[PDB]
Every structure is written in structure tokens, then in C-alpha cells.
Amino acid sequence: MKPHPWFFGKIPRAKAEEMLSKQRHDGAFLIRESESAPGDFSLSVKFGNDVQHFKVLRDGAGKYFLGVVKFNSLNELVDYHRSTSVSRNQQIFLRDIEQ
């Protein structure tokens, strides 16, 4: 029985950036309802001298998850995963077969 302190309703991006930028620690964050698309949520976070925004979605079962990058081809999917790990916990980057 206690509300979520990170929840700031539907404040504009400016107010979220203007606020978070004044923080002194990497990871300073808030959850806000998206201006872009209704029903969605936006995770604003402070990092360096910038404020990054991550899209959060809620599906028909009430499950929450971060949005993921999406590609126009398998060729772009594999090449992207040459630099970014395919596994969430383990660090696995794709390499051309040898021999």
C-alpha cells in the first residue's frame, strides 16, 4: 500500500528533460505517460549532459516491457547483432563461421 514515486503522470517531455537534467547522478529517472502515443509509457533517464527517452509498452495482458529495435531485413538484423549481444544476460556477439 504505497504509490510509485517515479510516476509523474503525463508531464511534457520538456518538463521531464528540464527536471532530470538538474540531477547529479546517472540513472535519475521518471515514468511518464507518453505524449506520442496514448496507452504507452515513457522512461526518461539522465545520462551525462543528456536526457534519453525509452518507450515502454503495456500489452493486453497488462505485461510491461521496453520497446526493442526492429529491422527491415535479416541482413540488418544479423549485422546489428555483430555489435550488440543477442542474449540478454550473456554477452554473445555474432561472428562469421570459420573454416
Binding site: 527517452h53 525509452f54 529495435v69
Partner: peptide
């Protein structure tokens, strides 16, 4: 404009 889009 989001990071993960």
C-alpha cells in the same frame, strides 16, 4: 524520438 525505436 526515443532511443529504443
Amino acid at each position: 524520438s526515443y532511443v529504443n525505436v
